[PDB]
Design a protein around this ligand. Structure first.
Ligand SMILES: Nc1nc2c(ncn2[C@@H]2O[C@H](COP(=O)(O)OP(=O)(O)CP(=O)(O)O)[C@@H](O)[C@H]2O)c(=O)[nH]1
Ligand SMILES: [Mg+2]
Length: 167
């Protein structure tokens, strides 16, 4: 059975854990419990292929920035999450992508840009600006909501397809 090592990254508060818990448990976490590092191994069917998703839910707190090198070396694809109502989280995406490229020593790393919290009306990052950033990276861009489940399945499955298509 093929395994896909997925890593969810992004600034503190963007909804990394809420996206992961919505994907696996089908419910929305309203609480904010900062993550250190959690892992989930889930069997799923994607495009008729039974596979194992090994998902790492990482810390956004800049205090745990030393743990990044290890998960960037082992991770096969990265879900780079920003929140559409947090401009700092959108600007921080560049730092996550640069560090991934440096650790992998490659500009072609499976990655998906995710604009989370699309259910909120307090938007500060234009969809067009995020689309333009993802185009400049050569990667897919998907808007998601861990509350409504909009784009959640699409974001994770698109990342698996990027790992499967880089292969
Ligand atoms: N409205 C809305 N709120 C969300 C969404 N995703 C997460 N949140 C909220 O944002 C807060 C932080 O979510 P959380 O999943 O812990 O974010 P995180 O990126 O994992 C935080 P850390 O980096 O410290 O692990 C929570 O209150 C959660 O309910 C979303 O899509 N929509
Ligand atoms: Mg978290």
């Amino acid at each position: 059975m093929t395994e896909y090592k997925l890593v969810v990254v992004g600034a503190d508060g963007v909804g990394k854990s809420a996206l992961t818990i919505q994907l696996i448990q089908n419910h929305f976490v309203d609480e904010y419990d900062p993550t250190i590092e959690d892992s989930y191994r889930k069997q799923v069917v994607i495009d008729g292929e039974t596979c194992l998703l090994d998902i790492l839910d990482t810390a956004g707190q800049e205090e745990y920035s030393a743990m990044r090198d290890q998960y960037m070396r082992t991770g096969e694809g990265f879900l780079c999450v920003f929140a559409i109502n947090n401009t700092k989280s959108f600007e921080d995406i560049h730092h996550y992508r640069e560090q991934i490229k440096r650790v992998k020593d490659s500009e072609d790393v499976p990655m998906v840009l995710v604009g989370n919290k699309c259910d909120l009306p307090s938007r500060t990052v234009d969809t067009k600006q995020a689309q333009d950033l993802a185009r400049s990276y050569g990667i897919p861009f998907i808007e998601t909501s861990a509350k409504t489940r909009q784009g959640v399945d699409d974001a994770f499955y698109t990342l698996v397809r990027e790992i499967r298509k880089h292969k």
